[PDB]
Design a protein around this nucleic acid. Structure first.
Lengths: 119, 43, 103, 93, 89
RNA sequence: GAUGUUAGGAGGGCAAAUCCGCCGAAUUUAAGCAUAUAAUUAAGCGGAAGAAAAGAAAAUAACUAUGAUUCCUUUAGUAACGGCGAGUGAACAAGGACCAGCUCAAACGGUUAAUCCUUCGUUUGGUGCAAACCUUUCGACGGAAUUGUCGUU
RNA sequence: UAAAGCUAAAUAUAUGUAGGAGACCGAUAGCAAACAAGUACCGUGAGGGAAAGAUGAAAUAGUACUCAGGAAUGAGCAAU
RNA sequence: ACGGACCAAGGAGUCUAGCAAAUGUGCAAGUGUAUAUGAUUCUUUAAACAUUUUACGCAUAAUUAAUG
RNA sequence: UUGUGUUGAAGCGAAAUACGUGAGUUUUCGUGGAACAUCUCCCUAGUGCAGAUCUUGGUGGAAGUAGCAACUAUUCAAAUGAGAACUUUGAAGACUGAAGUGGAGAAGGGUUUCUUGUCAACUGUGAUUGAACAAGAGUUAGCCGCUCCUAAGGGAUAGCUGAAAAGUGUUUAAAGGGGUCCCCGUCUCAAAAGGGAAACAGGUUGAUAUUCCUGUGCCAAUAGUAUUAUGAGUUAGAUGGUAACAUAUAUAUAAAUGAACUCCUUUACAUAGGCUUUACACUCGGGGUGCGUUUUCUUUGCACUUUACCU
RNA sequence: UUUGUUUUGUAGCAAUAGUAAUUCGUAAUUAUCCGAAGUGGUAAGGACUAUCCUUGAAAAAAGGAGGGAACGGCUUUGUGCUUUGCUACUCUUAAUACUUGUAUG
RNA sequence: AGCACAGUCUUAACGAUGGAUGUCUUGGUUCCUACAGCGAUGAAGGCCGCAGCAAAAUGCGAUACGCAAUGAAAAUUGCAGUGACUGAAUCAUCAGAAUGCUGAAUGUAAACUACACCAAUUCCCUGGGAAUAGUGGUACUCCUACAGAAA
């Protein structure tokens, strides 16, 4: 039974071959269960969750390196760019929405709505 | 029939698998059962 | 009332022609310069039966002139045509039974 | 789109589920030198041959395959005459 | 006569006209004209009709898993920036 | 024009209570029924948003005049329509809610498209642990555009 | 001042989601569904479409023991 | 003549609009404060309370197709 | 407003020297086990049932009644079991009668299959039976099929119509392949009886077999280079016969040069009639082997005496 | 090197299998499996005859042909083309070894 | 140890059958309030799976009745088992990771787990070392830019 935080420091090797041995022992447990031997059947849950934890750490490492590889570059793949709602993606940017012509801009700068008091 | 398609055979197997009773250990803490002759799968 | 039998014919559902064993449309040769200015002879190779019609159909083999090869035409056989006969079609074809001429 | 996770293609652990130990499968081992394995339905003859080769150091003459109504695939793997199914079955249980 | 209007002709009732319809999974796929009588599968659209409230409501949205929209629910009241995580303990 | 699995992108489907176009009945009422009514409705087809649509007068009035649109109270079951039968049926003013105005075209600018987009870069400072995000102006490159972009009003 | 264009608010919401309420219904009522309900089941199909809530404070009190019965059960000088 | 084998539970002049009459109540040549606004009320309260000395309905005048 | 409840509320059963004229009201006993009134006045409504071939549910008389009638037919003994007319075994009498309740398949079904249990319900009598219930198991293919081809035909493309939905499907089409510029050319689906690459026998399990095992075959595929080896041919492609035509037997008849471009053949086809050949079927006689009859007759009656694909 | 006379072999498969028998510890030994015909039931094939105002699919796939484009090997001139000295030389089946991504089903 | 005729009908008590009544109610209904689109970045819907013993419903996706992270924080249990003396047992949150086959479904198809073509592909170390027949891409229409042919 291993936790995610201790193996967060491992290299991808120590991750993948540990997964390999974890899968191997899970297969051995499943073979024993396939036979009549059911003494160790309850260890299958723990081994399965260990496999999940190892895969989680490995895949998060890989996603982080793959993000570093595309840092900036303005042309990240779709799975890397933002997963907002499609409508949000197609929305005009706030700058585009607020963009105004020179005529409107020089009107609003020279005559802005202003605070005052009525006696 | 003896001649079947893969999806049809898998569906037949699924129906057979679901036609089993409630596990005894569970019952100590089913209505949707069918017989091959009474109610047909129609699927 | 309801739609009468004559009106149902144009729908063409069960009133389409039974044409499964038809051997092909009976058309004579498409106009060519050979037909227009001279003659071209093709030989009749078989005289067959078209199940729809009563008239026999002659399979006339012509030799292609724009390329090497043969072309087969399905003609309505005139009475007297025989296999192995040479039919001549064109402006200069002689006036004889079987030949295709301008009227 | 690029994938960062490790492949979810079925490897041997998952291609081969477990050996069959029913009376029929059991007697096949001694009589006709054949092991009966249970596999995922997505395995094929080549997959099973390679997978048992890399799971236990044994090649086979032939694999016969059927799909059961229980949702998995039964593989009758006839071992080569050079070795025997008895010692392999003793090695794995 | 013998395969008469009722019981006799009911004996000749083999050979279905509908099968499972890979889209809606319901046995309404007409085999001869290759079209689901329930959902009109080969066509892009879903084949609904306003004259059947029952039919609409037994296969509307929310009848199934809502495998994705149920996840994106509640995002509006959290407003987490995509990619963000809670601060580690 | 054609063609490109050239680069970058978009549409498709679901869902509909409110909303926008189309298409479009009959039951019913008339104590029958045909115009009429039901109804510019139901059904059918398509299309959007958190609202939509309408909207800044080719508008009212006839006053001492009002001043984009929408909605509420009213006008008013009124003017009017109608086998003038059954039935149908608005508008202006008035009182309120809310309140907002604008830009193309056309005119003017050729001692000089003053415009725009693509790609590639540099730094300008910021809040994130990170992931990411907001600011940023100096270009260059390749194009588009005089069959007309931009500025002025 | 037509034959080009944009525009927030006041407005509507038998849908979805989430809150809050009521001189509402109280298991033949209230949604079809208080429950494994658009489920079981029916129809080739479009479609049609139910019934069914309540031990007790506590089963962490769900009936131990004996007798008679093949058993189901029953009876008790036995029992919660 | 038709309906009713038996029992339980369910089961039918109601709701809204509009008009009138009757009667009760308030005010009275008036009456109703509509939409809306305000206001230390904001569980109840979606109700109560309020309205800087020409909103509108009905009434206060009839009659005529009508200029009136 | 002012009250009753665990010292027992509501409800319900039977009632009362009770009140009322009457709808009712109020009490008692029992049961019940948690709520209930308010008649002080008033507000409110989904407010009062004998009927509607009323709705839903339950239950009667009919009535231990009608009935449990096609398919000629059962019997003796034993086993199992709590229990046997309808479970199993042996014996008998019969039936189906190769146009079969006999073997193989399709459609349809979907685990009903098999083994072991097993009887609450079902198996319209019984039931120890079962296609019921329960636990496990069981379906093995290069050669059997699908998969490929095309048919009647379906869908789609280009257009063109139509508000669209849809309708039609070459009606102004610049619409992958071949050799090396030219030539050909809509796509796709539609047959488990049509067309079609290639398998036989013996054996084997509780349950699978042209699928497993054994033996023997067959079909298709088999890249490039290099070594060998088999064969031909050649000092750029063999030879016999007058002819019809024939010839490569190497483990294996593999090789007899051959492009573009063509032209054919096979695939590939109805019905009727008889004649004919072959295989299988049936039958007769002989021989051998076994069994049967045997008061009498009987050189006798019966069974076996087999041989796949491939070459 | 041909024509007659004999032996063998169920022509190979093949008897080793199958069947029916006799025995033996309880898995083995043994012996047989070969001489002549008849009827016409089924199926298929053949060669025919007849019938049609009915003439009784297609394609995948395979084959045959007509035609005659191209042409040895080692080395070399010059610019795939004339050339020089020399002859043991091309196709086909099988196996092997290495490269080819793992080179059968 | 003896005695009632039987049946039919009436009454009472106690039972059977049945599920009314009363009392309950994690449900409905109506109003009010607030927010409001999801989808080629593959939706809704449909299949198929996933637990030690596991049918349904619920949950989830080959990491499959749940992983990680964050807050709480000792239980969870039918058995087996797992838990600290708090990233561990279980709740809640939920941003990271992962998300089978489909479906507008989009390489061609579809009562096929049938068939294409193009890149071989994926992982590991700091240019090598492995393993894989596996993985991606290819619809139609349209826009912008580009490309090379044409009159």
């Amino acid at each position: 039974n291993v936790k995610a935080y201790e193996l967060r420091t491992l290299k991808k090797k120590e991750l993948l071959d540990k997964l390999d041995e974890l899968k191997k022992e899970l297969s051995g447990l499943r073979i024993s269960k396939a036979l009549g031997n059911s003494a160790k059947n309850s260890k299958i849950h723990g081994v399965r969750k260990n496999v999940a934890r190892v895969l989680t750490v490995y895949n998060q490492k890989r996603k982080m390196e793959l993000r570093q590889l595309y840092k900036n570059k303005k042309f990240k793949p779709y799975n890397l760019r933002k997963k907002l709602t499609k409508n949000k993606r197609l929305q005009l940017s706030p700058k585009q929405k607020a963009a105004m012509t020179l005529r409107q801009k020089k009107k609003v700068q020279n005559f802005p709505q202003r605070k005052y008091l009525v006696v | 029939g003896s001649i079947k398609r893969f999806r049809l055979k898998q569906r037949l197997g699924k129906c057979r698998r679901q036609n089993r009773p409630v596990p005894h250990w569970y019952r100590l803490k089913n209505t949707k059962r069918r017989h091959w002759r009474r109610t047909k799968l129609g699927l | 009332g309801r739609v009468i039998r004559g009106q149902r014919k144009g729908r063409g559902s069960i009133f389409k022609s039974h044409n499964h064993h038809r051997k092909g449309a009976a058309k004579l040769r498409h106009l060519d310069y050979c037909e227009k200015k001279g003659y071209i002879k093709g030989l009749v190779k078989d005289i067959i039966h078209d199940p729809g019609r009563g008239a026999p159909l002659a399979k006339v083999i012509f030799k292609r002139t724009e390329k090497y090869g043969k072309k087969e035409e399905l003609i309505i056989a005139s009475e007297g045509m025989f296999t192995g006969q040479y039919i001549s079609c064109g402006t200069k074809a002689p006036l004889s039974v079987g030949n295709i001429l301008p009227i | 789109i690029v994938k960062s996770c490790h492949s979810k293609t079925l490897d041997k652990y998952g291609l081969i589920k477990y050996p069959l130990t029913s009376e029929k499968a059991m007697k096949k081992i001694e009589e006709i030198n054949t092991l009966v394995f249970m596999c995922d339905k997505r395995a094929n003859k080549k997959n099973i041959k390679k997978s048992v080769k890399n799971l236990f150091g044994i090649e086979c003459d032939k694999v016969n395959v059927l799909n059961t109504l229980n949702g998995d695939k039964k593989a009758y793997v006839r071992l080569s005459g050079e070795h025997d199914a008895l010692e392999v079955a003793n090695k794995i249980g | 006569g013998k395969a008469g209007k009722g019981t006799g002709s009911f004996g000749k009732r083999n050979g279905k006209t509908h099968f499972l319809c890979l889209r809606c999974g319901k046995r309404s796929y007409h085999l001869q004209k290759k079209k689901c009588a329930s959902c009109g599968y080969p066509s892009a659209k879903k084949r609904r009709f306003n004259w059947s409230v029952k039919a609409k409501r037994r296969n509307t949205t929310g009848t199934g898993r809502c495998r994705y929209i149920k996840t994106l629910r509640r995002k509006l009241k959290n407003k987490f920036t995509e990619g963000s995580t809670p601060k580690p303990k």
